[PDB]
Amino acid sequence: GAQAEVRIDGPIEYGVFESRSEQNIQQTTEVPAKLGTKFGMRYQLSGKQEGDTPLTLLYLTPGVVTPDGQRHDKFEVVQKLVPGAPTDVMAYEFTEPHEVVKGEWRLMVFQGDRLLAEKSFDVR
Template identity: 30%
Template sequence: MRVKRLFAFLPIVCLLLAGCSSTLNFFGFGGKDEKPQEPTIVLVDNGIYDANGGLILSTTAVPRKLGTTFGMRFRTLKPEGGSSKVRIITASPGIIDPAKNVVVFNTESTVDVATGKEYNCTFTFEKEWEMASGDWTLTAVAEDGSSVKKTFQVYNPQP
């Protein structure tokens, strides 16, 4: 008889304990004192750049035009006084490289960056076949997996 009563009250006790635990965490009691982690990589600016890397226009709308350079600028904050490797990923709507005769959707490279210095993560339309309309996403991924990412809409400008 006692066992049946125990089994009847056990789910209720579990729910009460779970509720107390959730409530304590909600109000900031219990759990670990976790402070937010400082980012490893941060976005500095984004948009259309001139030939010298200067920001011309802060935007995510990019005209489909030869010579246009668009993207973002980032900086790493760790390791202090050191350097690290950052993966640069460019995702396009798909461009057909005539040399390979294949559709390329993603390109990736790794660059060494000095902590605190600004770096450009950009793409320049240098050839007619590179100018694909649609979403282009540029991503810079730090060694610890943190990243900055920006998506640009490449459009056909009015004549």
């Protein structure tokens, strides 16, 4: 339809994603330093259109060192906006041991230079 700005619509959910239906999120900034833990944000965006600038999901980490020896202090993920998706998610899961790094993880959703949502998690 008519051109529209992409905007946050309603509350940002944040915390630990529960798996066993959509995933419940236990609201917290305190995340266990345990394999299999998934955490982050779930949110709703109004104005999403096909020709829009995609999202940049910027994960700042305390320094994940992969087995190849490289340190990842940030990860950047580009996500094309899907107009008909009711929710959008920015999550991180500790799938491998080197990913379980204690400290502050700051997850930031941008569109271009504009920050849509952010949350800081304490992993311990």
